[PDB]
Amino acid sequence: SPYSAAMAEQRHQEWLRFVDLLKNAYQNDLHLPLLNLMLTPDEREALGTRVRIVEELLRGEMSQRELKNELGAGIATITRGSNSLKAAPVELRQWLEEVLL
Amino acid sequence: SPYSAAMAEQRHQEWLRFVDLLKNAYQNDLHLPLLNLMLTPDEREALGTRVRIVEELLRGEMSQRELKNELGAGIATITRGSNSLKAAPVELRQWLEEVLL
Numbered sequence A, B: 001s002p003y004s005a006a007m008a009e010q011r012h013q014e015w016l017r018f019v020d021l022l023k024n025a026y027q028n029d030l031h032l033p034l035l036n037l038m039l040t041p042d043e044r045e046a047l048g049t050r051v052r053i054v055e056e057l058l059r060g061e062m063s064q065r066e067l068k069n070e071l072g073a074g075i076a077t078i079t080r081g082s083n084s085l086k087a088a089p090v091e092l093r094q095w096l097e098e099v100l101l
């Protein structure tokens, strides 16, 4: 059932319903309460850490091992982060270099 | 070590940086690739489902058991959603009723 075409199309629309919800929360300055509701504390912590991983990977100064030890993350976490950043569109990465660095 | 005011301070700074990066991404129409970068596929799926949990809990029509069975979720997931909703500030909750119902 989970691997069906119907379940996949529903999943895509459900995700975008969240994205649009959050867009509107930011517009009405309800983003912080919404994200407190919608996420667990450990998810929020992971997201704060992932920002630093992306930042430091784009910066290119720390090695992936240095980065793991600085953040208390596992090597595999850093590697997933690196894989995802490698796959990101150029337009995002270019912007991230502007705003994160 | 993770259980200190210093680490709580740092975690919040890091979380707010994510929140503000994403705020900025929405302003620049880069939210979609940023969320693809920063979240896993199971995380996005879970967020899409949690929007439905919150929607159906506010609607008040389905029982929590009906909800669990419709979404293929555990009872305890529905319970966590219900707990967070009961604790939500009224401004957030009223706005969710507005936009989701």
Ligand SMILES: N[C@@H](Cc1c[nH]c2ccccc12)C(=O)O
Binding pocket: A049, A050, A051, A053, A054, A077, A078, A080, A081, A082, A084, B036, B037, B038, B039, B040, B041
């Ligand atoms: N998009 C990534 C999410 C992710 C996992 N670990 C990370 C570490 C850093 C940055 C992003 C990530 C993925 O699907 O795997």
Ligand SMILES: N[C@@H](Cc1c[nH]c2ccccc12)C(=O)O
Binding pocket: A036, A037, A038, A039, A040, A041, B050, B053, B054, B077, B078, B080, B081, B082, B084
């Ligand atoms: N803020 C909630 C996140 C959550 C977990 N499961 C949910 C189900 C529905 C809505 C929100 C949630 C929490 O910390 O537990």
